[PDB]
Design a protein around this ligand. Sequence first.
Ligand SMILES: [Zn+2]
Length: 54
Amino acid sequence: MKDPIIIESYDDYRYVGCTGSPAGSHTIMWLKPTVNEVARCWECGSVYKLNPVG
Ligand SMILES: [Zn+2]
């Protein structure tokens, strides 16, 4: 929940899709960090972050 993984957004509130890793580890699933915030998986359990990017 610091800064684990980056999802390049261009919106403040956008979703993510992971499969665990670039190495295809689990299924596919969908989360949403926010510019201020973070979000956790349930399959890999990785936390993911949004960026302030415009
Ligand atoms: Zn995952």
